[model samples]
Target: VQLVPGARIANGRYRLLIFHGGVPPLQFWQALDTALDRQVALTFVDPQGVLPDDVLQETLSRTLRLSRIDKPGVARVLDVVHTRAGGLVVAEWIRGGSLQEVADTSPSPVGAIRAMQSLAAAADAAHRAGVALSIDHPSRVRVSIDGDVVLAYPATMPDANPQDDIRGIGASLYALLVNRWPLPEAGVRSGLAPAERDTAGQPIEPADIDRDIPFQISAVAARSVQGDGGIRSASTLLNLMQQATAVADRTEVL
Candidate 1:
């Protein structure tokens, strides 16, 4: 694997694997030239087929959404590249493995689903806080001119109290969903099965069913609010949500 000019190689041990198409003259020499000054072992693999357009879009979109920030101090930056085949290129650094290895070791279907949910929660929080946050479901989200995803939750009603603030509601929702803590049994249960029957064959029905699981919750924070509990920037909220997902069993949805 040769190093692209701007590619970052940290001091830690690394295995460089290049994914390229087709056979070419002096491939080994090119790889050698690329590897000359680097401190990592290099290997090259040929993927043969075209890297799917959908995959590229999905990867780019998710990366952007994950890195969104609302801080004014630094403008958001998105890097995109175009390949010889006209395919879009996006790259990120990982501490170990080849590209194929990383893809092979990527998160499971359930893990991806959980990540989407966490992202939704983050976006919801910003929207509720009057930050005007909008996301294209499942994969994409829009950012502001500064490269931050805009947080756009509506403000609380003028007559409402602190709890009525969208940001408060969003924060509560974020905590509840991220924790995956089941709701109290007494809250609500509509479709529970009946209790077992007695020896006499008389079936008994429980007074209530356990239907209190918090499937999903939505809340917003207003950007206009002046308080200590206002909504966080999209980037900050995204980081928090990703952290929560990481703690929820085995996952790498981001």
Candidate 2:
């Protein structure tokens, strides 16, 4: 979908951007708008059909009750504009490519580690805020021009758990390092070869995916995915990644 710029909303207090594509349902727009206020930016929902104004307001009210403990890393939805044909969802336009795009280009091992660190930080922040994120693949992650990681859509299912999010991050780190999903459970083809599995069909380890992957990096990924008591929380994973990065930096200086 293309984002049309130069749109205005809230008496010009917020800049507007209209997404031109299949408009989402009222719940989707309502969740986004309630999460991210219109004063910062407004998402204009341009739908293909007319929606009842009362329904729109009711959805917004329901979503507003869903409290957020901390700011999430996902893109924010600001406002919605209803039209005769449809509606438009106003959202913040992320200005960068997906993490999948970067991995496909064959980034250096150190570069991949750095990217994973950023991803972990974002996930950790969301976890701390009581937001359980589910990033199934690298495509769901966006890397800003300045190297900041922004999760595209950070919604979670009713059964979502923190461990699931951590495991997803582990799988994504493996993909970034080796350009392939590490688990057979992924099912989809990722162009690169899949990692070897044990009898239970779990990924063996990161180093097993590629001999060149640093032992430290591989071990972290393995622990995160396997939940082997190596890393219990997103914050712990972030701490480990940061420490590894620091050690790598010091070795470079030496």
Candidate 3:
């Protein structure tokens, strides 16, 4: 809540440094885990949203499982401390701007695919390990200074599923390529442009929005959206992205 600098929690192990702004359900701090001698992000859950301690334990167990995915750009959850008031979730401190800030303008078709490849790779890894790579919130994803989109915040909504993450991959790619948030389901109120829809109320394909977007790249994004013949999992999306990226890269060389 009102954690000031040097304030310690987690049985006085983590020392707070700076306050990171967050919404009502979430507030975070840049902190130090003195025990581990490492920087960590302390996300305090709102009391209203806190689950029972017993359920929170299960949440922590599942979180630890996801934490084993050691990949670049995928921030890991470190710990979760439960209490009578609220709960504290410790995550790795990742430095970068949100993807919403990263694509303030828009990326070229090739640039879009290249930028998306990072998360796709990480998502693939998480799925192969039997976990859903939740990209359900755009603000949780950051674009690193190293030019890769990172999952800066490892928080996932309880409603998130394997299919949602797959569609999230496509919606994010479409957002960067077309400069619009395609899916209101997850991308609503994301501050990006709202994608234009056709009479059927489905998001218009990215290629239709921008003629410069290659069919191969646009098709990859489309097939990942929610519909028949669409990408059903992160692993399949990664394979599609890799193949599409390779094809696009070759043309760029010519």
Candidate 4:
């Protein structure tokens, strides 16, 4: 995850924080800490201690093509912290209140809409940066705001797949925006509901039927396209979620 300057909050009372679990590129962390030090403090942890040396080293060496020396944004390396389970990466620790706290409440609805817009903008930014996101299976990704539960994943798909981190993060962000202020006429329907022809000409849910389909997982390393070429979307993602949800008997809302 690349952290850029101006991504921190300056409201004084509250702080904005970003937590990431998993190995991240070293230069990415170094740039964030150095360039954004005026606004944030970064911390990193790794379960296997494979981070600072392995993942972090390889990423920096590949991008910099140099051993190690004085660099502009290299000074802001994160202050490593220890945890009971393992180490973690703390991207930012902003010292400012939330946008809502700073805005007037006379126009409550307007304020609410603006908040949703802000979340949408953030999600869009991550998506464009190749971060994974999903609008349909929010529960699979955990999300919170101001220490309160902004949204909860359904009982189904309780755990997110590590491999789908990009999409999971993206989807969680989308869900946050949607939950805050959904479309005026948003209905309680799952995006993964089986599609069927209806007399009224609107897509309807198909009758439940027993069926099975072949699923295969192939291996591809460092290359962009996998066995099928570009990534799969919509139906492919929904199908996997539906299967998981069915086993748990929880309603899915895309």
Candidate 5:
């Protein structure tokens, strides 16, 4: 069932205003809670999803936990309505463009590191507790006044874990620096350029993609993507990004 604009739900109290972005089986939308006349983001979980029943159930259950976490980078989870093949998770509506827009605008090396640092910290906080809904898709991410990069849409998918969340930050940091999605399965519709790869099909480092990128910054992004030896913990990602950002800051000041 398509949620056309002006579609009413909750006994004509809430109205679906616009469709945000998400993949098949899961879609995001902007809606008006008529009683309060305020905008709310709604994430729909289509029963058509081939994903396991328990995982979907688990994802919905974890989303409710997000409301307990008072983090500025995460969108506040509101209500979760369970229905046949048509459940919806409500969240706080925010004002800003998608993460892709930020990458297209091309933040400076320091700015890039700073953005990921904020994002990494947010994901780290969630992981510290047993959750990892950090940036499942580039489109799921957005910028907000509260945080440069906000996981505006929060929900983890099947087979997701803490290490992959770090890699998501890694790929995100790489995109901000080079405007390319290093991870192969982007599948998400966005303007991000695909990462150039070597013959082995390994993602090229940001520095190799663009010599203008700081070597240290590039190394951190690469390590995060590879997810081996280093950049395992979100704090490790934070520390490395912090060092890179500090160096970039000093360089800029010089």
Candidate 6:
């Protein structure tokens, strides 16, 4: 998955990039369609190759059909095309990096809070538009140089609901604050420090992950991930995060 330079199609209307290797999760394709409808700049192909004329036409036709239903937050699909070689995916290029990239650099807590707030707002808007965003990983988000956050891709679940998205936002906040994944149950090794866990091996609390994390913000993150009696909606999480930010601001002033 490397962005290829000097790759373009249709007189440079869209840029070309190669996935290079490995099969992406099934949810990736479904999310791609959704992202396309939401106006996110993305499209792909499996195992880079030139499809037979009929298959190629069918693929283009299907993509065209999906593009008809437009909504806010969805980027316009200018055109979809194949490379001359066995390469694949030529679409408008987004000038930004993944949230993982941003997180690695250690943004201020306030910045992280603001980023989460923006993401929550976007997710809420998408929900109101009847779209449930599934953003399980940091890579699913893209942050522009101007601080604009966009859904780089959907999660790997074809049936992801608003609840999953809300949980994902919490997980993302946890990751940003601790530089680690909040859940140890997933069994994926996060390079950051291990999150403190209960006897049952669940994260104890967001505050446990980092004592400096504001109590309210930590509580929200913990509840959001706990999913038992925690934050239920993106709007709620956004409000909590905003309140935490306000408190942090006042404390600094005093």
TM-score of each: 0.21, 0.63, 0.80, 0.25, 0.88, 0.65
All models: lDDT?
0.27, 0.54, 0.70, 0.26, 0.75, 0.54
- Winner on TM-score between 3 and 5 is 5
Native-referenced Cα lDDT, model 2 = 0.54
Tens-place lDDT per residue, model 4, 1-254, is 32333343222211334332221211112113334444333323233444445554433322122112222211222333333323323323333222222222222221222233222333333233433222223222222243221111111111222234323322322222222211121122222222232464332211111112111100111011111233343233333333433432332221
Best-fitting candidate, measured by lDDT?
Answer: 5
Q: Write the per-residue lDDT of candidate 2 for residues 1-254, one digit (tens) a residue.
A: 22235433334343433321111331121112223443222323223324466665543432222223233345564444453324433445556665556667766555666667666776776667665665554444556676556555333433446787788788777777766666444322234466667787677776775776667777777788775556778899888777767766666444
What's the TM for model 5?
Answer: 0.88
lDDT tens digits, residue span 86-175, model 1: 322222221222211221333232233233343344444434443322221100121223222221211111122322223332322222
The full ranking of all candidates by TM-score, starting with the best, is 5, 3, 6, 2, 4, 1
Candidate 6 least-lDDT 10 residues:
21-30
The prediction achieving the highest TM-score against the true structure is 5
Winner of 4 and 6 under TM-score: 6
Q: What is the lDDT of residue 193 in candidate 2?
A: 61
Error of 2 at 184 (Å): 5.4
lDDT of 5: 0.75
Checking candidate 5 for backbone clashes, the offending pairs are none
- Residue ranges of candidate 3 with Cα displaced over 4 Å: 1-40, 47-50, 83-85, 185-189, 227-229
